[PDB]
Amino acid sequence: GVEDTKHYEEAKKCVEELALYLKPLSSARGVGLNSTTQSVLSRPMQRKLVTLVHCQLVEEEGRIRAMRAARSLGERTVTELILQHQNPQQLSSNLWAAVRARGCQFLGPAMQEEALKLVLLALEDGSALSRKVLVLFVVQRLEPRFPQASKTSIGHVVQLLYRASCFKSLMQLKEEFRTYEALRREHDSQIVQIAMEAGLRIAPDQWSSLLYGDQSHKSHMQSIIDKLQTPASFAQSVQELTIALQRTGDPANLNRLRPHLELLANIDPSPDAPPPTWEQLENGLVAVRTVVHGLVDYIQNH
RNA sequence: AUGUUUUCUGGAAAACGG
RNA sequence: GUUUUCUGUGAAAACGGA
Ligand SMILES: [Cl-]
Ligand SMILES: [Cl-]
Ligand SMILES: [Cl-]
Ligand SMILES: [Cl-]
Ligand SMILES: [Cl-]
Ligand SMILES: [Cl-]
Ligand SMILES: [Cl-]
Ligand SMILES: [Cl-]
């Protein structure tokens, strides 16, 4: 076209403004005291900003890299927004409330492990049992050992495996889930998905505490989280931030960032992606400037 | 990072088959 | 080609020396 240069100039201006947030004080948490002048931008955010800033927008290859970098920055931004907004003291309560609202339940690390191993004792041979019969089998063995357990709560553990698509009036375990390691993984993954859909962001260390009551299942939880990551993850995470914000009313109007974030999520990150037009380059960089500006402002004020 | 872990990603050997 | 044992390389991600 002949607007190519003009698009370049706007794109360059966006990147210039973003680069200012990497300067030692521009993103300070608070200027009241030297001890609080640390940047609000996490190490991943700073890495991803440096990567974008380094893109040569005067070369096609540089423009392709800038779009990938804009997408990566925007996806991390949603996570940072959720994390800053998130109330650590209400986290476990919001998690179990989300689980229980779906008629599911996590009885606790020792009780849940036992419930699942009992389900396997009944079903690992391929038997197809009615729900009432399976629940009864589990309750008769579990309840004397864990008096807090009940027929109602075991039914909820069974519903969680059901909602996790582990089965198939009659319940039969899929062949792939007829071992404890496989069944437990799918169970754990379902809880993580419930948490994410509730707008929660929980790290592998805390997941290990919540689901296992120790710190020796971090890599396992990290594995689960990573297998849930797809190209659709960024767009869904935008909708999940919305849930998190509605839990408290969104006084900062973070919801205004939605269209910009959704534009970024629509960026095709694959290497077989056609280079961006100049228009797409400008729009993408405006969007990522707007959201990073949004994040920094949110943290510095809240 | 000559640090920890995770996701995706391609060769050796053993036995068998044809 | 099937099954088993053992193992490459690269890209990316989280944690993180801070
Ligand atoms: Cl340039
Ligand atoms: Cl470049
Ligand atoms: Cl919260
Ligand atoms: Cl829910
Ligand atoms: Cl629960
Ligand atoms: Cl327990
Ligand atoms: Cl713990
Ligand atoms: Cl671990």
Side-chain angles (χ1 to χ4, degrees):
Chain A
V2 208
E3 295 288 291
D4 303 8
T5 288
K6 178 188 190 78
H7 280 315
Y8 169 82
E9 281 160 5
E10 181 58 23
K12 202 65 184 166
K13 181 174 302 193
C14 289
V15 170
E16 291 174 354
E17 181 172 325
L18 287 158
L20 292 183
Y21 297 114
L22 293 171
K23 299 312 274 201
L25 207 60
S26 309
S27 296
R29 201 155 211 106
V31 303
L33 307 168
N34 293 333
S35 68
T36 62
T37 49
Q38 305 85 16
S39 174
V40 302
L41 293 181
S42 63
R43 300 184 66 171
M45 287 295 292
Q46 293 192 36
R47 270 195 307 279
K48 296 157 199 301
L49 272 168
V50 168
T51 294
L52 178 57
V53 173
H54 289 193
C55 294
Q56 291 303 293
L57 305 179
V58 293
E59 313 204 304
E60 171 176 274
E61 184 53 51
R63 294 188 292 273
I64 291 171
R65 287 169 182 158
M67 301 283 82
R68 282 198 291 263
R71 191 183 195 277
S72 174
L73 259 175
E75 188 169 17
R76 183 66 203 175
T77 296
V78 176
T79 301
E80 302 282 346
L81 291 166
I82 294 167
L83 288 171
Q84 177 65 211
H85 175 273
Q86 194 163 275
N87 180 4
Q89 287 80 54
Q90 286 300 284
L91 183 58
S92 78
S93 290
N94 287 320
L95 170 60
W96 308 128
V99 172
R100 298 293 310 278
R102 302 183 180 213
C104 301
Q105 188 159 2
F106 177 77
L107 300 177
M111 209 167 332
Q112 197 85 344
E113 170 189 323
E114 179 107 70
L116 288 202
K117 284 178 179 182
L118 291 172
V119 163
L120 282 155
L121 176 62
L123 298 181
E124 70 207 337
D125 69 350
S127 299
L129 299 184
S130 67
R131 191 183 262 254
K132 183 84 178 70
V133 162
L134 172 65
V135 168
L136 186 59
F137 177 90
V138 173
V139 176
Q140 285 175 334
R141 296 156 176 74
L142 186 62
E143 185 167 343
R145 312 196 187 194
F146 294 94
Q148 191 179 344
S150 69
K151 188 119 66 50
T152 298
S153 66
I154 301 319
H156 299 158
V157 173
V158 170
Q159 188 61 9
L160 178 59
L161 302 177
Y162 179 71
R163 299 280 297 253
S165 306
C166 291
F167 300 115
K168 116 161 295 304
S169 191
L170 288 183
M171 317 290 267
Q172 188 174 5
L173 281 173
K174 296 185 177 156
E175 179 159 329
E176 44 260 57
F177 303 130
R178 288 176 190 170
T179 70
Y180 177 78
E181 180 244 298
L183 187 61
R184 185 61 199 257
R185 167 171 287 264
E186 196 68 13
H187 162 278
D188 286 352
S189 184
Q190 187 67 13
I191 299 178
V192 170
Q193 299 171 241
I194 293 174
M196 287 178 74
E197 294 170 3
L200 310 169
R201 289 310 184 266
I202 302 177
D205 65 348
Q206 185 164 24
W207 273 121
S208 185
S209 295
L210 292 159
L211 298 185
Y212 289 93
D214 59 42
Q215 288 297 289
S216 70
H217 290 87
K218 291 191 298 182
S219 296
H220 167 83
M221 295 304 319
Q222 188 183 1
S223 172
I224 285 166
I225 290 164
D226 293 348
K227 300 176 90 97
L228 290 169
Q229 176 76 24
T230 77
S233 285
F234 184 178
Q236 196 171 339
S237 80
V238 177
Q239 308 316 309
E240 302 167 344
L241 169 64
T242 293
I243 294 295
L245 305 171
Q246 76 170 32
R247 188 174 277 121
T248 52
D250 193 28
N253 194 27
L254 291 174
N255 272 318
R256 79 190 186 270
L257 300 174
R258 222 152 82 185
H260 301 284
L261 293 163
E262 290 176 337
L263 177 164
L264 292 171
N266 180 68
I267 288 167
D268 176 8
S270 68
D272 61 278
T277 68
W278 286 102
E279 185 170 271
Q280 288 176 314
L281 186 68
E282 165 166 348
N283 289 340
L285 266 28
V286 163
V288 78
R289 180 257 286 145
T290 299
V291 304
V292 174
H293 169 52
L295 172 59
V296 168
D297 208 272
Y298 181 60
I299 303 175
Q300 291 178 327
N301 287 72
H302 299 73

